[PDB]
Amino acid sequence: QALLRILKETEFKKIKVLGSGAFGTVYKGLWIPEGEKVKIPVAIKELREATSPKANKEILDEAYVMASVDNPHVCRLLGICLTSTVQLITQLMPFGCLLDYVREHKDNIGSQYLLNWCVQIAKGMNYLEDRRLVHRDLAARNVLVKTPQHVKITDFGLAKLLKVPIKWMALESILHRIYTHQSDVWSYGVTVWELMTFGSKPYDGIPASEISSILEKGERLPQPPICTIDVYMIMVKCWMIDADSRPKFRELIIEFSKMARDPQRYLVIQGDERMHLPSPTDSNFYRALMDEEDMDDVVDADEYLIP
Numbered sequence: 001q002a003l004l005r006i007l008k009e010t011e012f013k014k015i016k017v018l019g020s021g022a023f024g025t026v027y028k029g030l031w032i033p034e035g036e037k038v039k040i041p042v043a044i045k046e047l048r049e050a051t052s053p054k055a056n057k058e059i060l061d062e063a064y065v066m067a068s069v070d071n072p073h074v075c076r077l078l079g080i081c082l083t084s085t086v087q088l089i090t091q092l093m094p095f096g097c098l099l100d101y102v103r104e105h106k107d108n109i110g111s112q113y114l115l116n117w118c119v120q121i122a123k124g125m126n127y128l129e130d131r132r133l134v135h136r137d138l139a140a141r142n143v144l145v146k147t148p149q150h151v152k153i154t155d156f157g158l159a160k161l162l163k164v165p166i167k168w169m170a171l172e173s174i175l176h177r178i179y180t181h182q183s184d185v186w187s188y189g190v191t192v193w194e195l196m197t198f199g200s201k202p203y204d205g206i207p208a209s210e211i212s213s214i215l216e217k218g219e220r221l222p223q224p225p226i227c228t229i230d231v232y233m234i235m236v237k238c239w240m241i242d243a244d245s246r247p248k249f250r251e252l253i254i255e256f257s258k259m260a261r262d263p264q265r266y267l268v269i270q271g272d273e274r275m276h277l278p279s280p281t282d283s284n285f286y287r288a289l290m291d292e293e294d295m296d297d298v299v300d301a302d303e304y305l306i307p
């Protein structure tokens with residue numbers, strides 16, 4: 001019944017690799033809770049750096065807060081396994097990361113989807129601010145697609161305890177290692193900019209070492225071709241030097257929700273009205289994650305977790 005489930009090595013299996021980078025490797029696999037006779041599709045993140053049994057209580061305390069998050073726009077930590085390594089277990093998000101998604105589907109993404117994703121991300125970020133949890137690493141690479149209609153924030157927590165994403169960071173975080181919910185708003189603006197450019201790399205060609213001086217001179221990310229000046233001004237406001245003058249996530253939810261009621265007024269996308277995204281049944285990203293032989297008689301995590 002534990003909110004943070006403590007999993008034995010025997011209670012999960014890594015089936016295939018999903019991704020690999022800085023902090024470690026993510027696998028698609030199955031959660032098979034002991035004696036419960038049920039198989040749950042999960043992702044498994046195994047951290048690169050070794051762990052000691054001493055820091056374990058500090059990791060568990062941090063992990064408890066991550067396991068406590070319950071919002072439809074935030075991924076919940078389902079379980080943890082601490083041995084020589086730290087392994088984290090979460091619900092498999094069967095469409096992958098949003099950064100990749102928008103790059104892939106740039107020809108079938110309408111203004112309605114883009115604006116709805118902005119709303120969902122702000123709602124998730126507002127929920128973390130209610131839990132007094134600064135994300136520190138919001139970016140489109142850390143948002144996951146549950147269905148084309150529904151995205152979720154991931155990769156928050158353990159950050160201060162365990163490469164620097166300079167181009168997403170607020171100026172005060174770069175200069176003084178100040179992180180707050182208002183620095184998260186700055187990263188949210190870069191995130192929205194990534195979505196609206198269908199996954200462009202921010203400040204392409206500018207080296208990370210020069211970013212602080214460019215921001216001090218007043219330079220910012222340019223207006224995405226699809227964005228009206230109403231939408232671009234929201235982004236610009238997220239990057240004000242004065243962190244207290246930036247929008248709050250609560251205010252962002254309101255503004256983007258208004259835009260989402262009349263989407264073609266705020267984004268100009270050629271052929272907008274005719275754009276459709278492949279369903280779970282019609283998707284080959286989805287069917288590639290799920291048509292494996294070992295992904296046979298499974299139960300979705302949201303279902304299993306009905307108390």
Ligand SMILES: O=C(Nc1cccc(Oc2ccc(Nc3ncnc4ccn(CCOCCO)c34)cc2Cl)c1)NC1CCCCC1
Binds near residue numbers: 092
């Ligand atoms: O890790 C966290 N916190 C944290 C917070 C919550 C959960 C959580 O667990 C996971 C997070 C992400 C993923 N990945 C995926 N999950 C689901 N479906 C897919 C599909 C493709 N992927 C792969 C692409 O994922 C993109 C996101 O990386 C997926 C896997 C797990 Cl288990 C870790 N903080 C770190 C802070 C810095 C130091 C190290 C800890």
